[PDB]
DNA sequence: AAGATATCTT
DNA sequence: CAAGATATCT
């Protein structure tokens, strides 16, 4: 399938290549910093060619947002199925120690999931799947990373990360019940070990429950204290008649 | 000086090199995306070696934040004058012409000396902005080292400048939910030449220290530099 | 103007 | 954790 082929390709590319710097047309290389903004960008760039190759092998068109602030990073679709689009977002996080529990931010809960068209490339209802390509790595302190390098010194450039793992999973499957950010109102994933993401050991029973939960999640602890603040309280609120 | 040598080295580096991709240790190259998240990251990384090299020449230690959401990107100080630190932030924007930059939070360390800042605010004696401006070009394959000149670049004509944060600061928020200081909205020449609107750094700090978060609240205080000067006249109320 | 894009810190 | 930081755009 497109999906199994994609994760096999991402998994393989991750095992075979180690990004180590940004290169200029003239051949000069500038090392990577260890901060999350840097690594997030690099893994998104790393993923692009792979997503395109696999999509193309399957007859899917790949479209990226024309505008900044628009979800998703990649919209895939066969010309013949414009209402079965696939959204692919890229999410990254780090670990201080290998194999510790992790959590991702999974996008806003107050735009297109509530407003079918706010900040989304195509109206929400034209997508049948929303996949997260998750990357997790153990951070490594940055020294030798403060100078430039030449192509003949590639293997020598220090990398600010060490044990990158990648997964491809449905957004609803790994979504948790606690926000992943405050002022930027993000859906938070489960807080769990990497294996749980791969396995899909989430908290929602269905994609409809996930959607309903995030569609009605209040923005502040104050308000959630009176409605629901976790999945158990949500199920109680549902039981009661959404009140 | 440290400052003139830094601006000269940034100008020169930018003229000589065109970043065009991310490379792996195995030699495979991945092209750049065209959005700001990508470009701001690349210009920041591009600037790191230049900054360190010039700081070393002048005898300054260079320190980056351990926590990613802490200002500034680079803290410079001579070990003999720890209390005279220099902060350098990198800010980027694009053009298709007047431009504007986001210049950092106005509700953290400028208000409470220690919030989200590497060293207490009072230990810094200068705040420099390295500004990159580029024209957006309006590939999904991988390349090898022999194809460097073949990789499409997502930008056209980058310009870089170094200026004091207060000099290029404006009076309108550069962001909403993330409460950023906005720079002046002007021509690139204006940032180079320092044609701002604040009469002093004291005014700039006081203006952003007292700027309300939303329009409604600002309407009862001040929404621009003129209203702020009137607020000062009223006795800061 | 206010709120999107990613994800971290305490 | 909840809230607000990091950058910058629409
Ligand atoms: Mg995304
Ligand atoms: Mg910065
Ligand atoms: Na995310
Ligand atoms: Na900025």
Contact criterion met (CB < 8 Å) for A48 and B33? yes
User: Which of B25, B36, B48 is facing A30, going by the closest CB pair?
Assistant: B48
Asked if B101 contacts B94 with a C-beta cutoff of 8 angstroms, the reply is no
Question: How far is ligand 1, taken at its centre, from the CA of residue A65, in Å?
Answer: 10
Q: How many domains does chain B have?
A: 1
Residue A105 Cα, gap to closest chain B Cα (Å) = 16
Question: How far is ligand 2, taken at its centre, from the CA of residue A97, in Å?
Answer: 27
- Report which of A58, A56, A44 is spatially closest to residue A10, judged by C-alpha positions: A44
Residues B168 and A52: their CA atoms lie apart, in Å, by: 42
Taking the C1' atom of every nucleotide in all shown strands and the CA of A222, the nearest one is: D2
Asked if A139 contacts A95 with a C-beta cutoff of 8 angstroms, the reply is yes
Half-sphere exposure of B150 (CA within 13 A, CB side): 10
Residue B135 Cα, gap to closest chain A Cα (Å) = 15
Residue whose pair of structure tokens reads 């810094």 in the numeric block: B124
Helix axes B36-57, A36-57, angle to 10 degrees: 140
Contact criterion met (CB < 8 Å) for A146 and B62? yes
User: Which of B18, B25, B65 is facing A24, going by the closest CB pair?
Assistant: B18
Residues A229 and A224: their CA atoms lie apart, in Å, by: 5
This structure's resolution (angstroms)? 1.8
Asked if A34 contacts A159 with a C-beta cutoff of 8 angstroms, the reply is no
**Which of chain D's bases lie under 7 Å from a protein CB?**
1-10
Residue A166 CA distance to nucleotide D2 C1' (Å): 29
CA dihedral A147, B116, A164, A5 (to 10 degrees): -110
Domain range for A218:
1-243
Residues A122 and A116: their CA atoms lie apart, in Å, by: 9
- Report which of B109, B105, B126, B127 is spatially closest to residue B118, judged by C-alpha positions: B109
- Report which of B97, B115, B102 is spatially closest to residue B186, judged by C-alpha positions: B97
Asked if A118 contacts A111 with a C-beta cutoff of 8 angstroms, the reply is yes
DSSP A142-155: --GGGS-B-GGGGG
Tell me, what CATH number does A94's domain have? 3.40.600.10
Cβ within 8 Å of residue A67, ≥6 positions away: none
**Which of chain C's bases lie under 7 Å from a protein CB?**
1-10
- In the structure, ligand 4 is a single-atom ion and the residues with CB under 5 Å from it are B 91, 102
């Amino acid at each position: 399938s497109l999906r199994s082929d994609l994760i096999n390709a991402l998994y393989d590319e991750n095992q075979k290549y180690d990004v180590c710097g940004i290169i200029s047309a003239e051949g000069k290389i500038y090392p990577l910093g260890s901060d999350t903004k840097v690594l997030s960008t690099i893994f998104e760039l790393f993923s692009r060619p792979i997503i395109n190759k696999i999509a193309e092998k399957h007859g899917y068109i790949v479209e990226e947002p024309k505008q900044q602030n628009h979800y998703p990073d990649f919209t895939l679709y066969k010309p013949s199925e414009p209402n079965k689009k696939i959204a692919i977002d890229i999410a990254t996080t780090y670990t201080n120690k290998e194999n510790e529990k992790i959590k991702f931010t999974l996008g806003g809960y107050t735009s297109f999931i509530r407003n079918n068209t706010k900040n989304i490339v195509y109206p929400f209802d034209q997508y049948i799947a929303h996949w997260i390509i998750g990357y997790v790595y153990t951070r490594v302190a940055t020294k030798s990373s403060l100078k430039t390098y030449n192509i003949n010194e590639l293997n020598e450039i220090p990398k600010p990360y060490k044990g990158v793992k990648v997964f491809l999973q449905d957004k609803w499957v790994i979504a948790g019940d606690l926000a992943g950010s405050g002022n930027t109102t993000n859906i938070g994933s489960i807080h769990a070990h990497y294996k749980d993401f791969v396995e899909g050991k989430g908290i929602f029973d269905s994609e409809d429950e996930f959607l309903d939960y995030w569609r009605n999640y209040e923005r502040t602890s104050q308000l959630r204290n009176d409605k629901y603040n976790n999945i158990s309280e949500y199920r109680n609120w549902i039981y009661r008649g959404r009140k």
